[PDB]
Amino acid sequence: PISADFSEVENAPSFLSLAENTDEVLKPYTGLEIQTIITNIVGDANPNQSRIFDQDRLRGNQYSAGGLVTQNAVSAIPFTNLIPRTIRVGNILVNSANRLQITETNVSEYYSNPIIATKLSEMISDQVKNNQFSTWRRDNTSLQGFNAFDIATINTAILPNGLSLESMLLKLSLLHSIKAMNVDAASINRSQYQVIDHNTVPTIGAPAVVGVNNSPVFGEDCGGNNPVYPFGGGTGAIAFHVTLQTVPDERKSYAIFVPPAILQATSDANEALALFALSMSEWPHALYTVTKQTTDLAGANAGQQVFIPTQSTIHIGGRRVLDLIIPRREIAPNPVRPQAGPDATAGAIPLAAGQLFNMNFIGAPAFEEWPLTSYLYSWAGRFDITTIRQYMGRLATMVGVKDAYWAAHELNVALSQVAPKMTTAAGGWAAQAANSAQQSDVCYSSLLTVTRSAANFPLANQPAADMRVYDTDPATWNKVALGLATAANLVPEQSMDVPFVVGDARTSFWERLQAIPMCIAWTMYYHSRGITTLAWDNAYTDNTNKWLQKMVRNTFSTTQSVGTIIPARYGKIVCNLYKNMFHRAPAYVATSVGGKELHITHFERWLPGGTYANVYSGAGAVVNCFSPVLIPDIWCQYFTAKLPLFAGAFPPAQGQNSTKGFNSKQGLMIHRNQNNNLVAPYLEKFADNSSYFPVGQGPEINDMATWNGRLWMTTGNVQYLDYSGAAIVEAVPPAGELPVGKQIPLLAGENAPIELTNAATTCVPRYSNDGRRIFTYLTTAQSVIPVQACNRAANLARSCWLLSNVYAEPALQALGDEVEDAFDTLTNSSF
Amino acid sequence: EKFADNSSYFPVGQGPEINDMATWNGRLWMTTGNVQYLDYSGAAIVEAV
Amino acid sequence: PISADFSEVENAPSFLSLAENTDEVLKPYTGLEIQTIITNIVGDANPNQSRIFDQDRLRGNQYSAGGLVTQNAVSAIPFTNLIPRTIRVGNILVNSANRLQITET
Amino acid sequence: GVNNSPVFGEDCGGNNPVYPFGGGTGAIAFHVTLQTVPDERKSYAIFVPPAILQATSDANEALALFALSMSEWPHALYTVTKQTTDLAGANAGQQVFIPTQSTIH
Amino acid sequence: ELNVALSQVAPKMTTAAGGWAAQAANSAQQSDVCYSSLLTVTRSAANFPLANQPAADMRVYDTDPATWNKVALGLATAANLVPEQSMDVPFVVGDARTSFWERLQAIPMCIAWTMYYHSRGITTLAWDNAYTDNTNKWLQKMVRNTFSTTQSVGTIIPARYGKIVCNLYKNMFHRAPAYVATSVGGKELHITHFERWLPGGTYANVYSGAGAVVNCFSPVLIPDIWCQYFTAKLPLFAGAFPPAQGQNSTKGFNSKQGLMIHRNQNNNLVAPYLEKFADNSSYFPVGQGPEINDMATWNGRLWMTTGNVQYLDYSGAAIVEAVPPAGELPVGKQIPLLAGENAPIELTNAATTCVPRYSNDGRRIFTYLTTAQSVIPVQACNRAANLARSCWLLSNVYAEPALQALGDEVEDAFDTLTNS
Amino acid sequence: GAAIVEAVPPAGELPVGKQIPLLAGENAPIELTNAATTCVPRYSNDGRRIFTYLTTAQSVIPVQACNRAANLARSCWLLSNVYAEPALQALGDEVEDAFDTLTNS
């Protein structure tokens, strides 16, 4: 919450009390909490009436330090899943001189929720089979579409993991988030076409065109019609078998049963084989683009920019050769529909390729492999989000897809909503230049720089992994999609129990708002202890200060117990800084060591390797200091139930008292080194007895003093020196300049932020790369009013927002269970 | 003594333990008329024999 | 366990106390749970490949006697079930001038 | 592969197969009853129950898995041939390996 | 489990100073190769098909027709033959990941045998020549018991001292290995592959850099880190060396823990704080061998890692066994590197634990350094200095700064906020 | 780390005692044995604190001596209870009372 006076800066919760464990069961963060503040929609659903195109930013009055009120001053929503591979430089479109930002997961099978053979599986073994041991009979007890010698080779030795529908449901959770950009124009913001390319105005009118393999720079049309995989040059292979006898002799264990519940006479019914073959194989199969008509700032040069979404750059899968076994009607003996296959058509795209598809091959003979990047390229303009929604409802009737899609969905939001770093400026609204690394350099919500590609596409290098995600194995999928095994995370449901995000037009708006509390929780994690940006980068193996290696060691997921993931320590600190600070729990998955079942969130599955949230200067130079700051503060304050005390709104100037500090009555002291000219704030009592941290000590979490340090570097002329006033190794901003948010184009009657209002002031540097303590200093002449404001005998004029705090309770309808519809109050006893 | 096989060299704060069972038993052997005063391993010493 | 200091060496059980008879349940030690001790490992230079073709070695940082950190240093996993009958000798394949190992039960 | 090893014999009947651990070839006779055998090995006749003949879908790969499991290991000397390359990648070839579990008597 | 015991087969070692040695391109010592039981695999001498059939290695049972025929017809039901379901088949059967799993199941077998053969240091010629030429009643007792020699009537009798190996697997990994049921004298007992081996055979010795046999250690086959990183509770004598530049780094065990120093300083040649002798000084008694002491075996490998180590005698004379050229501990096999990926540095891929203590002669082996170069290990044993050894930085082990500029105690930043 | 107003000695050159002429069979002091060590400066004329410094490289061994992880080597007078320590500390048991319990101990 933002502050009305100093008596609620002072009576704000601490960090240690707000990072404690919580035993409450909390509702999921739906993204509607930020929505019902920054838009005209407070109540309920609105089809096309609510113009979300214009409602894309934080708006409010501001109050300057000089006593003036700015009327309509805006802060951008700082997250988008769209990297502009065509940049508007000099009011005209040119190709990007920048590589594409790629991520990579760490897909591996772990001990999920345990699995058990059903009464059908004990029925096949006990009866039938066991009874063929006396009758000399080799009859067929065919289950629904498969041979008895196909079920008999699967009702066998079961792996003791249990499956997690996570990788296939992130691919479904991911192509959904791509294919939901072409829904309308007044349902997708214009700010999220302007987050990186800020010299750009997209248009109401023509919607976005979600294309595939048509990006104009650095390869990236990975076979525009001769398609390969983007990660690794190769085309894969798919084969549609009717028996396991046809799978040649080599694979036969990798063979995936397509269950007959996902293909019924309810849809196109042959697109569902492509969503199944796309969920089970590999992401990405192709490099999707989003092309939209844009215009420059005044509006002359209307062209079409090419974007590439971030979730088409996430390398997940490792299954490139699929052998799919198809249900054979009711019951038939083993044999162009040889054995009564319902279908296997190619698609809708003509696809002149290496096997030369013509326009749409209908073919399910015995072996006869196709390519897989080709077979998925043909079904790349057909995957609209309504079809994905009803496919999810057909999945939900046989397995439990409610909680696993929401965990996979905020996994998508965790590694897909990606934000440009910062720019250091004095006032408000600085950005970068065009055709430069600094405009396109970009970070996660975890304050962690996204790796861009090193060489031209399709890639042979395979960069380091970023996140540990699970996967469906084919061998357990073949028996849980067939009634032969069951678990507690796999209990089936109805299509009403599909989450609200699926098949809705408002996903590109909601998913960029779900990523803001992730960066608030990581932002408050990285700012309680200020280790700049250099003592985070080369911190994993520094032989100085064993404390710092323990910090970076524990933050990441590098431990195990039995064959399963032990989640990270200190990512539960971020999770508790999410549940306490937002009163809403993030979605976990299950992992079991043995018996004991414990929970791991995207807060606990990151991996080491990679630099952190850097800040740039006005001329593009690196200012690796402060702390890993991303989005501007007011996001890390206003949209918050309980923000810890060191991060706080400087309260408005009401009477004679505006902004004060914390003095030696709270256990603090002034540093006051060698020279008489520069003095430091009221830091801790340990600050004068250190000067360099001991090899197992770090910055003590004091929010009286971190407040009191950002209270001094808001003055506008500070230097970040030393215990003795000497320089540091770290790059310092050129003046009294702070990291400030990204500037987007304005509208009519709508202003830019004024002075340290769209800034990030909380990033107080306290721990240099060398292990020495960083002190913020002022001249003796220019520190009298800050020292007396700490002593409550003066006041400091600071700028603020003129908003008020509401923070409503959760709705739990979210446009996803509108079961009030009159035709099921009467079909209600039958459920 | 029992310590004679577990030493071979005295520790820096140990010396010859006063045993008169064994000092008797050492002059009982050098009265025989053909002895050598060697070492733990039968090597010579610095002292004049 | 790897010793972080010498107080973990002194507080280690003896050979006699680690070789008595025990009467517990003690589930079997499957390689499905030995694969994670060699995969989920501590290191920042580790590229973390997901495929079994690359997850063979024991990768890790090493800290020398003089106080220097070697980033991604590997120990070979030393157990195969494959006698090479054609050795890569002098950059090209020659057949092996060695007999074959036999066992008998 | 099977019986493909180039040197030190090891093509144990490369096209006329014999046992690797002795000069021999063995004998199979599929008889329906005990009153049909060579009247000197009735005490060593093996009934194949129909459950084995109902195990595999081919129903005749399962006699051969039952002749291989009841008689003698090894019946032949298995090889594993894999395309390999040298240390930098110049000389692509295919090494012949023999698994250790095909040399257990 | 008893094909992994005898199909996962590993090349022996190579003596070297630093890390990562291998043998040659075509050599009889490169493909020289051992079990997980530290026991060299018999190489065929004849040509296939083999004329002379060698000695057997492991005892197994059989399947006869005379009982299978009655079982297949419902004329026979036993206690170990109660039928079950197809979902109760072992999940290894039919999976693509078996060869990777069996490769990993063999490592905790070789740790149990490695801690068996290193507790008493019974140097590889004493294990090899324990049937060839022995005059000691102890060394023949050690091989007779360890391997399953005894037979009553048609029943695999489990070996003594291979239940010690089976208890070094349960008390050390907290996992029991799979067994069968077996009645010896009407008593129901269980037997594991640790208990089914047969006596005879060369054991796992070490080759030099030039290819010569270096059979003066205990049998080693895998380096230290596989014993130390994979173990829940590991014994004292085989412990990881903690980091170099820290307080409480690397010390030893002196006479405060009951040990005694040998110090043959006339030949500038002193030995560690070892155990008390009790008629074990030069020759062992006929029927006795080295005591299990972990204080002194830790302390002996603490001197093998110094760099110029002599393995001589009570009086300081050479032993019959083949000594490595320098302080050149057996080190692991070198495989080719990948992109951004290093070799081991210095005694980090080595096998340190194999301290020789019992010669082939029935004679005690002493580990020696020079009087000048042992002042610092003796003060490390006296806890008046630390030693600097290389280590793996894995999961709790942090790089120690050179200037130990320690502060207060406690030091719990985000640790009390978690479960601490 | 700046200079003080006071007159510093040229090196590690502690104040040492006055030298008188020697006699027959009689030596000079050796190394900081006739010195005055205790005079540690702590308060300058400026009202300023004086710090005793070594280089970061040459203070690793005194810091470990303060951490009780090393010993230091200083010269001493061998007077009435102080014995010359051997280089190889090859200690034995405890107690070690030879003629000492026979006297008042």
mmCIF file of C-alpha atoms in Angstrom, chain E residues 78-191:
data_model
loop_
_atom_site.group_PDB
_atom_site.id
_atom_site.type_symbol
_atom_site.label_atom_id
_atom_site.label_comp_id
_atom_site.label_asym_id
_atom_site.label_seq_id
_atom_site.Cartn_x
_atom_site.Cartn_y
_atom_site.Cartn_z
ATOM 1 C CA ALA E 78 5.887 -73.850 -3.788
ATOM 2 C CA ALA E 79 6.181 -70.926 -1.393
ATOM 3 C CA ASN E 80 8.221 -68.869 -3.877
ATOM 4 C CA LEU E 81 5.884 -69.312 -6.805
ATOM 5 C CA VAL E 82 2.580 -67.695 -5.751
ATOM 6 C CA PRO E 83 1.419 -66.047 -9.003
ATOM 7 C CA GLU E 84 0.902 -62.328 -9.316
ATOM 8 C CA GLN E 85 -0.174 -59.651 -11.774
ATOM 9 C CA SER E 86 1.438 -58.184 -14.866
ATOM 10 C CA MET E 87 1.651 -54.787 -13.130
ATOM 11 C CA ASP E 88 3.914 -56.398 -10.498
ATOM 12 C CA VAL E 89 6.675 -57.162 -13.013
ATOM 13 C CA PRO E 90 9.903 -55.250 -12.192
ATOM 14 C CA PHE E 91 9.781 -51.956 -14.095
ATOM 15 C CA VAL E 92 13.327 -52.439 -15.394
ATOM 16 C CA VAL E 93 11.907 -55.065 -17.797
ATOM 17 C CA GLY E 94 11.235 -53.404 -21.137
ATOM 18 C CA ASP E 95 12.529 -49.892 -20.447
ATOM 19 C CA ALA E 96 14.964 -47.897 -22.556
ATOM 20 C CA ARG E 97 16.844 -46.721 -19.453
ATOM 21 C CA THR E 98 18.123 -50.086 -18.181
ATOM 22 C CA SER E 99 21.707 -49.763 -19.400
ATOM 23 C CA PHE E 100 22.021 -46.366 -17.718
ATOM 24 C CA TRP E 101 20.447 -47.705 -14.514
ATOM 25 C CA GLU E 102 22.539 -50.901 -14.306
ATOM 26 C CA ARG E 103 25.600 -48.701 -14.804
ATOM 27 C CA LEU E 104 24.553 -46.743 -11.703
ATOM 28 C CA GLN E 105 23.536 -49.738 -9.589
ATOM 29 C CA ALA E 106 27.086 -51.090 -9.833
ATOM 30 C CA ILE E 107 28.639 -48.066 -8.101
ATOM 31 C CA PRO E 108 27.229 -48.679 -4.547
ATOM 32 C CA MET E 109 28.376 -52.309 -4.842
ATOM 33 C CA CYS E 110 31.969 -51.222 -5.451
ATOM 34 C CA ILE E 111 31.789 -48.774 -2.545
ATOM 35 C CA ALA E 112 30.862 -51.637 -0.214
ATOM 36 C CA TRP E 113 33.653 -53.838 -1.551
ATOM 37 C CA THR E 114 35.999 -50.835 -1.562
ATOM 38 C CA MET E 115 35.372 -50.169 2.120
ATOM 39 C CA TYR E 116 35.760 -53.898 2.772
ATOM 40 C CA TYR E 117 39.195 -54.197 1.153
ATOM 41 C CA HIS E 118 40.518 -50.923 2.605
ATOM 42 C CA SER E 119 39.685 -51.376 6.298
ATOM 43 C CA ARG E 120 42.496 -53.898 6.686
ATOM 44 C CA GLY E 121 45.218 -52.969 4.234
ATOM 45 C CA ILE E 122 46.024 -56.408 2.872
ATOM 46 C CA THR E 123 48.077 -55.290 -0.192
ATOM 47 C CA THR E 124 47.052 -56.786 -3.598
ATOM 48 C CA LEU E 125 49.887 -59.341 -3.704
ATOM 49 C CA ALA E 126 48.677 -60.625 -0.333
ATOM 50 C CA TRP E 127 45.230 -61.077 -1.851
ATOM 51 C CA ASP E 128 46.585 -62.584 -5.078
ATOM 52 C CA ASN E 129 49.184 -64.905 -3.531
ATOM 53 C CA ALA E 130 46.911 -66.082 -0.724
ATOM 54 C CA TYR E 131 46.443 -69.372 -2.586
ATOM 55 C CA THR E 132 49.625 -69.373 -4.707
ATOM 56 C CA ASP E 133 52.156 -69.267 -1.852
ATOM 57 C CA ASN E 134 51.108 -68.601 1.727
ATOM 58 C CA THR E 135 52.686 -69.583 5.022
ATOM 59 C CA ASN E 136 50.429 -67.366 7.160
ATOM 60 C CA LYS E 137 47.353 -68.863 8.800
ATOM 61 C CA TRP E 138 45.588 -65.476 8.661
ATOM 62 C CA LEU E 139 45.839 -64.566 4.982
ATOM 63 C CA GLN E 140 44.449 -67.963 4.002
ATOM 64 C CA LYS E 141 41.626 -67.500 6.528
ATOM 65 C CA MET E 142 40.729 -64.131 4.976
ATOM 66 C CA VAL E 143 40.169 -65.575 1.494
ATOM 67 C CA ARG E 144 38.510 -68.784 2.712
ATOM 68 C CA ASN E 145 35.854 -66.852 4.590
ATOM 69 C CA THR E 146 35.216 -63.846 2.269
ATOM 70 C CA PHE E 147 34.264 -66.064 -0.675
ATOM 71 C CA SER E 148 31.589 -68.769 -0.693
ATOM 72 C CA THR E 149 33.801 -71.821 -0.337
ATOM 73 C CA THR E 150 31.663 -74.095 1.819
ATOM 74 C CA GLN E 151 29.148 -76.641 0.500
ATOM 75 C CA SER E 152 26.920 -78.982 2.462
ATOM 76 C CA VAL E 153 24.662 -80.740 -0.113
ATOM 77 C CA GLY E 154 23.368 -78.910 -3.218
ATOM 78 C CA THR E 155 22.940 -75.461 -1.617
ATOM 79 C CA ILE E 156 24.829 -72.177 -1.982
ATOM 80 C CA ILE E 157 26.242 -71.555 1.496
ATOM 81 C CA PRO E 158 26.638 -67.803 2.147
ATOM 82 C CA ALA E 159 30.141 -66.580 2.796
ATOM 83 C CA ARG E 160 31.336 -65.183 6.072
ATOM 84 C CA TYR E 161 32.757 -61.640 5.846
ATOM 85 C CA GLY E 162 30.508 -61.016 2.804
ATOM 86 C CA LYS E 163 27.781 -60.371 5.288
ATOM 87 C CA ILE E 164 30.157 -57.648 6.468
ATOM 88 C CA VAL E 165 29.970 -56.286 2.913
ATOM 89 C CA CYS E 166 26.179 -56.669 2.990
ATOM 90 C CA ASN E 167 26.113 -54.714 6.260
ATOM 91 C CA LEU E 168 28.372 -52.054 4.724
ATOM 92 C CA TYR E 169 25.581 -51.584 2.177
ATOM 93 C CA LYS E 170 22.634 -51.371 4.581
ATOM 94 C CA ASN E 171 24.287 -49.259 7.299
ATOM 95 C CA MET E 172 25.865 -46.996 4.702
ATOM 96 C CA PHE E 173 23.256 -46.454 1.982
ATOM 97 C CA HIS E 174 20.157 -47.244 4.132
ATOM 98 C CA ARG E 175 19.018 -49.616 1.379
ATOM 99 C CA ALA E 176 19.059 -53.358 1.388
ATOM 100 C CA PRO E 177 20.174 -55.404 -1.621
ATOM 101 C CA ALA E 178 17.910 -58.037 -3.128
ATOM 102 C CA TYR E 179 18.226 -61.634 -1.977
ATOM 103 C CA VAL E 180 16.823 -65.144 -2.291
ATOM 104 C CA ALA E 181 15.728 -67.597 0.384
ATOM 105 C CA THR E 182 18.015 -70.535 1.151
ATOM 106 C CA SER E 183 17.860 -73.320 3.751
ATOM 107 C CA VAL E 184 21.261 -74.606 4.904
ATOM 108 C CA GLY E 185 20.573 -76.730 7.975
ATOM 109 C CA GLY E 186 16.828 -76.295 8.214
ATOM 110 C CA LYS E 187 17.385 -72.649 9.167
ATOM 111 C CA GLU E 188 15.949 -70.051 6.806
ATOM 112 C CA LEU E 189 18.659 -67.606 5.733
ATOM 113 C CA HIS E 190 18.999 -65.075 2.935
ATOM 114 C CA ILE E 191 21.877 -64.713 0.484
#
